[PDB]
């Protein structure tokens, strides 16, 4: 544990095989500055404003991925190590701002203890699938080298609606459902 | 203006494996003290680390001994890693972060006092500091001239 006023992570290169699954991010004090869309070869700023005040060449992320892709292959052939087991992720659902009926808001599903970083987080409203108004983050690294990830649902708070965050993962025998309603307390 | 980045070093050369590399810059009193650490992680185990307090790569587990030794034994590889404290950590903090992260100020909103949507984190019963993941937090703030 290193003490500091601030920590910049410049950056984070995650790769998995099989599947050729890559991710490249920058962090500052635990928040994502950007990720590099590896298919579009493009820097994606989490705060659009930051992308208007600073810049980052996405090729730096692409080349980081090429290095770790090569490193992982060598390590896998060199090691006799058994792969780490799948973890069971744990989810929490909370609104972004104070609930005011009729006042637009965002429902946050915070998913932790993710390992490996492959997951499906989706939303349901009154047991009906909800695809519109959904945004999710990259996989954030944790100290124990599991990951977390947040999914967001924009919504109008009303009395009747029941929301579920649904999490599907290799470490779960069955999908986990976390519930929230406007009256509920976290 | 432009973020620079850390260059991970390269191994000399059906089962699911996860690899992770990270370049960490720790700042205290601005850039009066910078501590710089890179971490090479395989299969949930950090196995090689560079730490500017140490000044060379070290094997965190036995698996990392050949790789730490190789990276230390190539003068260009070792000096370029050492230099990243300055070319990445210091440069980013004094350049781009001074236009983005270090200038962000989001004013907080206020049986319950919901103090929400503020940044940065310095601010009978109130839950722990929760991180919204969108560069705000919820739970007398740097964004406020006066404290109702």
């Amino acid at each position, epitope marked *: 544990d290193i003490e500091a006023d601030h920590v910049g992570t410049y950056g984070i290169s995650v790769y998995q095989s099989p599947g050729d699954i890559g991710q490249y991010t920058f962090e500052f004090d635990g928040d994502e500055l950007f990720y590099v869309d590896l298919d579009k070869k493009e820097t994606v700023w989490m705060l659009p404003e930051f992308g208007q005040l600073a810049s980052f*060449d996405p*090729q*730096g992320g692409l*080349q980081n991925i*090429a*290095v770790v*892709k*090569h490193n992982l292959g060598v390590l896998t052939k060199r090691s006799n190590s058994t792969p780490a087991t799948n973890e069971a992720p744990q989810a929490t659902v909370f609104p972004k701002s104070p609930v005011l009926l009729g006042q637009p808001n965002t429902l946050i599903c915070f998913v932790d203890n993710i390992f490996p970083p492959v997951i499906n987080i989706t939303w349901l409203r009154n047991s009906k699938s909800v695809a519109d108004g959904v945004y999710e983050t990259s996989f954030f690294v944790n100290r124990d080298y599991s990951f977390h990830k947040l999914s967001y649902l924009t919504f109008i708070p009303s009395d009747d609606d029941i929301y579920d965050c649904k999490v599907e993962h290799w470490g779960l025998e069955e999908p986990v459902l976390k519930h929230w309603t406007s009256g509920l307390e976290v | *203006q*432009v*973020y*620079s*980045l*850390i*260059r991970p*070093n*390269e191994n000399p050369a059906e089962r699911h494996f996860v690899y992770q590399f990270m370049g960490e810059c720790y700042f205290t009193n601005g850039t009066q003290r910078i501590r710089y650490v890179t971490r090479y992680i395989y299969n949930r185990e950090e196995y090689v680390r560079y730490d500017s307090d140490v000044g060379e790569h070290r094997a965190v587990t036995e698996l990392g001994r050949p790789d730490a030794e190789y990276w230390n034994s190539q003068p*260009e*590889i070792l*000096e*370029r890693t050492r*230099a*990243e404290l*300055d*070319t*990445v950590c*210091r*440069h980013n903090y004094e*350049g781009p972060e001074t236009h983005t992260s270090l200038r962000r100020l989001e004013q907080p909103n206020v049986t319950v006092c919901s103090v929400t949507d503020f940044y940065p984190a310095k601010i009978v019963s109130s839950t722990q500091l929760i991180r919204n993941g969108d560069w705000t937090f919820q739970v007398e703030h740097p964004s406020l001239k006066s404290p109702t």
Partner: T-cell receptor
Amino acid sequence: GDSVTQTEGPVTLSEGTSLTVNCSYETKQYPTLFWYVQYPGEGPQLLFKVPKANEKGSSRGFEATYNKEATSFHLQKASVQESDSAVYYCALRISSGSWQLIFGSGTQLTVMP
Amino acid sequence: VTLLEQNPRWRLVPRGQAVNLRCILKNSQYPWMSWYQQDLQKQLQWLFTLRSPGDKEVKSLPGADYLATRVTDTELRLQVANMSQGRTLYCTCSAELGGDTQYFGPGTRLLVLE
């Protein structure tokens, strides 16, 4: 913009006289600075590098100082030899993108024996 | 000894035609293969660094359209099309990503002939 500007030339010197090829650079990053040399009929090749600000590098009697305050990397040799006839390129690299080289336009030198 | 071979060494390119260049890495310990162009005024300019087999990328510069491919660990390719101005294409290699010593290959010289 990150860029390198060097003497236009062409330069012609008598053998045994001194050479100065000026090089300015512009970047907000922390560059590593280089000279490359290209002899007639060959591709470019590294002459020397300097990664630390205010340090000197040198090779084959050439030298250059990474002058941070003047953002300069001027090439000097006290006593040119006929075999130094070549094109000299100032270049920088920054830790960004593909860590690629950005080259000055090059300065041709002819040394009369 | 030399680390790189480039085929062809010279080519005349009729307008509306494309040409295919190869760069052969003779020593796999220098796997970071790049393309640089040098124009008719001797200006050098990086085009591509492609580490992994299967990598492909396109880039359009004044005077030429480029398609680069890393075909194997020892084989880098370049297709040059819509070439309105001659140039020289250098393959380079280094032991690490952006290594301090870029080794320049023998070069492919392209000319448009009307």
